[PDB]
């Protein structure tokens, strides 16, 4: 629907500017001239700027000749120090070309956005090639991951090829008939979930970005991917359920919960996600529920939080020492979020925290340790270590209680 609603008249000012500026007979700007402007030894951003700015005025029908030069040279736009307006206008022109010339534009655009270290890199990514394996479009040069216009382009491509692949393999299984439908549905669900996971991993800050600065290209790409995932979840919430059952790196949970308004449906299946055997899935469920409770503080959210507290208290006395550490290290920062969402949980949260603190203290007492936290019973506050698991878990319990008390007190 994005391409169709793009065609919709907004105000008609574009027609006015068409009739006014294009009448200058500056239409001497030709694809060969644009290609020459791109291939200057210096960057020479002025000439390409003027040409593509002029091309914005061109109607979609006559803009077809410029498809080859714009797509072929968009790899050069990844270089450092390219002006933003160049990429913005390229995005606008690509959207226009997509509105009138979708399929071959997609084929040539994917062929153009190859990593380029492999040079040709199998330029035979035909229409069928992408239609069978939509994830090819994600196999692109790393620089697009922090280039918001071309990233938006790639997201459009990815959505289109997911739907195209669905219809394609449906048609293929129909014609090859001469059960398999279950395998079709499973393959489609797996493909959509895999696309979602790759996008989420793109949203992660890399090590260099890890090496504050909340306004950058990464935030723009995160917003774009969040919008696309919102569209996908609206299209099929079962994909959201499958992705969350698969889980993903918990650093994204604030980002994903804040940027995907359809995420509120997660409270429906979180009770069933909790009941999975895998410890990792339960940990992820607790973290997800904590972020949602921060976001949406609803009675159903409170009931699911009560269930979360009860299961954490339950399997506190089912897990071994190593399992206790591995489970309660990530899910303890969720308790402060639960306290923030729901004051009526203070009783159960504090009772659970006391029980786990005494269990961990006894566990510390069983074996000789380095720090011996029990004798350090009168320590002060310490805001922000390869020690043994139990003292780490005790310090984590301490920090959880510190955060809860500090936020409630102020």
């Amino acid at each position: 629907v994005d391409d169709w609603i793009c065609e919709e008249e907004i105000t008609g000012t574009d027609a006015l500017l068409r009739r006014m500026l294009l009448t200058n007979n500056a239409k001497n700007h030709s694809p060969k001239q644009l290609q020459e402007a791109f291939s200057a030894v210096p960057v020479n951003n002025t000439q390409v700027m003027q040409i593509i700015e002029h091309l914005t005025l061109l109607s979609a029908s006559e803009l077809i000749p410029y498809a080859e030069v714009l797509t072929s040279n968009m790899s050069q736009l990844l270089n450092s120090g390219v002006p933003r307006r160049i990429l913005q206008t390229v995005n606008k022109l690509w959207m226009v070309l997509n509105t009138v010339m979708p399929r071959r534009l997609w084929v040539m655009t994917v062929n153009a956005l190859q990593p380029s270290i492999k040079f040709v890199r199998q330029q035979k990514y035909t229409q069928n090639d992408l239609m069978i394996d939509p994830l090819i479009v994600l196999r692109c040069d790393q620089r697009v991951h922090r280039c918001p216009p071309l990233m938006d382009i790639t997201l459009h491509m990815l959505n289109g090829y997911l739907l195209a692949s669905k219809a394609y393999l449906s048609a293929h299984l129909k014609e090859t008939e001469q059960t398999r439908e279950e395998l079709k549905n499973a393959l489609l669900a797996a493909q959509d979930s895999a696309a979602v996971q790759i996008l989420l991993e793109i949203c992660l800050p890399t090590e260099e970005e890890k090496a504050d600065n909340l306004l950058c290209n990464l935030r723009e790409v995160q917003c774009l991917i969040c919008c696309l995932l919102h569209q996908m979840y609206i299209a099929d919430p079962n994909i959201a359920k499958l992705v969350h059952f698969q889980g993903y790196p918990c650093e994204l949970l604030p980002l994903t919960v804040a940027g995907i308004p359809s995420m509120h449906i997660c409270l429906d299946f979180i009770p069933e996600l909790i009941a999975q055997p895998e410890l990792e899935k339960q940990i992820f469920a607790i973290q997800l529920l904590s972020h949602l409770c921060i976001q949406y503080a609803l009675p159903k959210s409170l009931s699911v939080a009560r269930l979360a507290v009860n299961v954490m208290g339950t399997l506190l006395t089912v897990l071994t020492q190593a399992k206790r550490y591995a489970f309660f290290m990530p899910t303890l920062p969720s308790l402060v979020s639960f306290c923030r969402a729901f004051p009526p949980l203070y009783e159960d949260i504090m009772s659970l925290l006391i029980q786990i603190g005494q269990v961990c203290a006894s566990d510390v007492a069983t074996q000789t340790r380095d720090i011996d936290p029990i004798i350090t019973r009168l320590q002060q506050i310490k805001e922000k270590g390869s020690m043994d698991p139990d003292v780490q878990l005790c310090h984590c319990i301490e920090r959880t209680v510190i955060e809860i008390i500090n936020m409630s007190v102020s």
């Binding site: 979840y233 609206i234 919430p237 959201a240 308004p261 359809s262 509120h264 449906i265 949406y296 609803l298």
Partner: peptide
């Protein structure tokens, strides 16, 4: 109902 936030008005028919 993923298209409507839980704190949005409910369209009662």
């Amino acid at each position: 109902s993923p298209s409507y936030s839980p704190t949005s008005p409910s369209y009662s028919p």
